[PDB]
Design a protein around this nucleic acid. Structure first.
Ligand SMILES: [Zn+2]
Ligand SMILES: [Zn+2]
Lengths: 197, 196
DNA sequence: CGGGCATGCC
DNA sequence: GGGCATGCCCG
């Protein structure tokens, strides 16, 4: 019916994202390309995303992740797990089986299947960093490959990360492209080389 | 539990023939005598010829069923993967879960077995048309051998049985099937892997 | 159909 | 990491 905004918005708290530096060994479970602003990862493997802010949002602030198709031809379509993976019983105990994006390690995670847009998202309460740290790290998992037939079917996606108050009002927004694939190092390297040809 | 795959020509001298289609990369259906194996593309016509020495009785039928070839999966029902089951490729006769359809036969019947839950497709036996010495059935395979959540790279066999009207066996033959994007490429590859 | 390549897997 | 199996796009 409509399309979510993907416009970078630092907001009043100076909200931005950070990623580890991981390298490009042919596989490697998760690697991020600064050149492409694109995460490359394997199915069900830890994808760390760092949340950086300048002030600190109030308690009750939430951090939401949602996938959308990058291409305008599919952008109104909801990003979901393919029929196979939806039915494969790899439940972590909380994530519903149709959801592409999961959060690891957080008892307070909530999954939303919006009644009106039909879009899936996963949301955790915002927490300040630990002592000795400058950022909050969320561990995401992507539960289908970009290639899965009947699901993403090779269509590229964006993950939109939004900072929101308790009622769902926008406080900040950032995004990154993601490719979920068998060989993240190889594929990251390939796409970076295509940028130099 | 596993249906028999024992070849028997039975009293009517029942056996199968296949077109001799060669190995151009993407030939739609091609059969390897050395491998007794059909290689074919998803949803493309796969002609299977029925040859008999004498005409079986009125009411005879011809059934096709797929089974897994490897012992570790032989007990599992062969079915289409979750994706293909749900794609919009119905012919309005075949159940969406069934791997094997018959095209061009309004008298086709499909069965899910009471006890084994295996799928099959059955058509009336018809004698060859005038000028012909065999009867051709046009099968279609509706999932690739490689499909995740289904065959998932496990080899299958198709078992063709000739049956009387009550289902009693008159004859049986079988062939391996690989459903794939490039049947010629893949046949030539397999036949080359036979050699030292 | 199919050269050329994308993308699974070990 | 290499490679090889095996699928898809658009001419
Ligand atoms: Zn999937
Ligand atoms: Zn399939």
């Amino acid at each position: 019916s409509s399309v979510p905004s993907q416009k970078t918005y630092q907001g009043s708290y100076g909200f931005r994202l950070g990623f580890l530096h991981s390298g490009t060994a042919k596989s490697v479970t998760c690697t991020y390309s600064p050149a492409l602003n694109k995460m490359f990862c394997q199915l069900a493997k830890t994808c760390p995303v760092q949340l950086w802010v300048d002030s600190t949002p109030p308690p009750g602030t939430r951090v939401r992740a949602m996938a959308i198709y990058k291409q305008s031809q599919r952008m109104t379509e909801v990003v979901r797990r393919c029929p196979h993976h939806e039915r494969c019983s790899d439940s972590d105990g909380l994530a519903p089986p149709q959801h592409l994006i999961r959060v690891e390690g957080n008892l307070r995670v909530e999954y939303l299947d919006d009644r009106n847009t039909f879009r899936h998202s996963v949301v955790v309460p915002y927490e300040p960093p630990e002592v000795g740290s400058d950022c909050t790290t969320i561990h995401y998992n992507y539960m289908c490959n970009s290639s899965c037939m009947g699901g993403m079917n090779r269509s590229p996606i964006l993950t939109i990360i939004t900072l929101e108050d308790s009622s769902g009002n926008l406080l900040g927004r950032n995004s990154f492209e993601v490719r979920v694939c068998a060989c993240p190092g190889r594929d990251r390297r390939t796409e970076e080389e295509n940028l130099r040809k």
